[PDB]
Nucleic acid binder design. Structure first.
Lengths: 225, 215
RNA sequence: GGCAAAAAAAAA
RNA sequence: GGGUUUUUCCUUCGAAACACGAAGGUUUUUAUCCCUGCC
């Protein structure tokens, strides 16, 4: 029932400024310590700030003091993180964590937000062009065969793909975006089913790129005759 | 006077039912103010052990932690497939707080051969003057497996990108995407597009393909 | 033996 | 030696790493305080 929901990250240019927030539900933020923990792409976690209860005292990693500043609003049951003078090194996913109850878990962090990704870059955003990958056959199609959407040329991460608006989960594989020399991302999402049910069912993928503010649904079919 | 956490190792791989042990050593005293987390790819971390050794309410019993002075271990009595994750140790003894570089536990399972696929570049993408033939390896093990592209039997190099999923949480299989990127010229220029993969479920290397036009 | 006194500030 | 009067460190707890609070602890420094009268 307890839940933290961070938001407010995205693409920002070097020297720029952001504000993240952390919306608490399930418990009142005034009676625990709230911390922000960031995680670079593919690297490890790093503590950033925390504010402790009653005193409202804050503390910051050496990486970000002077630039970062953590506040809490007990009425909106929200904790915030104003970020100034942003640098490429600051590109990461940002988590807010609650410090558990002293008896229940000491200084352990017992609930975490799902994290909000901050991209520090000079580049400007592009949404993807999405192309279907069709199951290719020159004879009869009575087996299990695969199909998928190619999602090419976009920036920044992330995109979210969903087959038939969430109806299809078994055997779905959304590959991690790889970054082309172009400087844009591109990935492939594949799903497997027995072709016995190919002709009766429909295969649309729900692609969504909120940075670029793009939502596209392509409709995967077979090829020539 | 910042405390630094030194986790060991960076990666490791054990079979199901194996016993596995991670350790973190502290630069200086942290009392028993140490916590351990599990992080599955992409999702947020999860508390496994608080107070260096106490087990968090709800975690399985197979995870335990102990402290020997400044030497902290995290032990998983029986490995299970659900347990492929990345583990971090955290000191909360003083500020600033410090984690380890992280241990990435992989899982050992029987060899599983990939089922291979090739896709012609959709012509909507040929509507845009570029080519993306793409090759696929679904549900296989181990991770290390090699794709070669041929174009009219001409071996290709330096033009293809591979991407691989994380290990599966149920059967601990992998999956790979080799995407060859080319022009609209080079696609209707040559005729056959071969993709050969050499892996250990294969006595001999398997190759799948098609021709251009005849799709 | 039985009473009564008196009286400033620092550190773990 | 025994004290008075002020400080701190530590411990358990308060929704509690600091700050605030409650209940507790056993040490030691300052020749930089008192160890004086009465049947």
């Amino acid at each position: 029932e307890v839940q933290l929901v961070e938001s407010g990250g995205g693409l920002v240019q070097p020297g720029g400024s952001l504000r993240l927030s952390c919306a608490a539900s399930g418990f009142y933020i005034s009676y625990s310590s709230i911390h922000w923990v960031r995680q670079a792409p593919g690297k490890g976690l790093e503590w950033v700030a925390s504010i402790s209860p009653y005193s409202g005292s804050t503390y910051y990693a050496d990486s970000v003091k002077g630039r970062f500043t953590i506040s809490a609003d007990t009425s909106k049951n929200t904790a915030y993180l104003q970020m100034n003078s942003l640098r490429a090194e600051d590109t990461a996913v940002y988590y807010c964590a609650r410090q558990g109850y002293r008896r229940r878990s000491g200084r352990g962090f017992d609930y975490w937000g799902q994290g909000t990704l901050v991209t520090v870059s000079s580049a400007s955003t592009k949404g993807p062009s999405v192309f279907p990958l069709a199951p290719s056959s020159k004879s009869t199609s009575g087996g299990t065969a695969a199909l998928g959407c190619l999602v090419k040329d976009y920036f920044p991460e992330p995109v979210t793909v969903s087959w038939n608006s969430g109806a299809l989960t078994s055997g779905v594989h959304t590959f991690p975006a790889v970054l082309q020399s172009s400087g844009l991302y591109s990935l492939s999402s594949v799903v497997t089913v027995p072709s016995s049910s190919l002709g009766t069912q429909t295969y649309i993928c729900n692609v969504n790129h909120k940075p670029s503010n793009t939502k596209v649904d392509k409709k995967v079919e077979p090829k020539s005759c | 006077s910042d405390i630094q956490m030194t986790q060991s190792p960076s990666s490791l791989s054990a079979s199901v039912g194996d016993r596995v042990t991670i350790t973190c050593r502290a630069s200086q005293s942290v009392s028993s103010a140490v916590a351990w987390y599990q992080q599955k790819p992409g999702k947020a971390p999860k508390l496994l052990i608080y107070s260096a050794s106490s087990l968090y309410s709800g975690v399985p019993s197979r995870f335990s932690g102990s402290r020997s002075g400044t030497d902290f271990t995290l032990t998983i009595s029986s490995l299970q497939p659900e347990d492929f994750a990345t583990y971090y140790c955290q000191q909360s003894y003083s500020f600033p707080s410090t984690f380890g570089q992280g241990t990435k536990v992989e899982i050992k399972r029987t060899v599983a051969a990939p089922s291979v696929f090739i896709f012609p570049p959709s012509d909507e993408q040929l509507k845009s003057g570029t080519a993306s033939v793409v090759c696929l390896l679904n549900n296989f093990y181990p991770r290390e497996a090699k794709v070669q592209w041929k174009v009219d039997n001409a071996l290709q190099s330096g033009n293809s990108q591979e991407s691989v999923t994380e290990q599966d949480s149920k059967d601990s299989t992998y999956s790979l995407s080799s995407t060859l990127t080319l022009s609209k010229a080079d696609y209707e220029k040559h005729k056959v597009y071969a993709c050969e993969v050499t892996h250990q479920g294969l006595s001999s290397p398997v190759t799948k393909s098609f021709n251009r036009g005849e799709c």
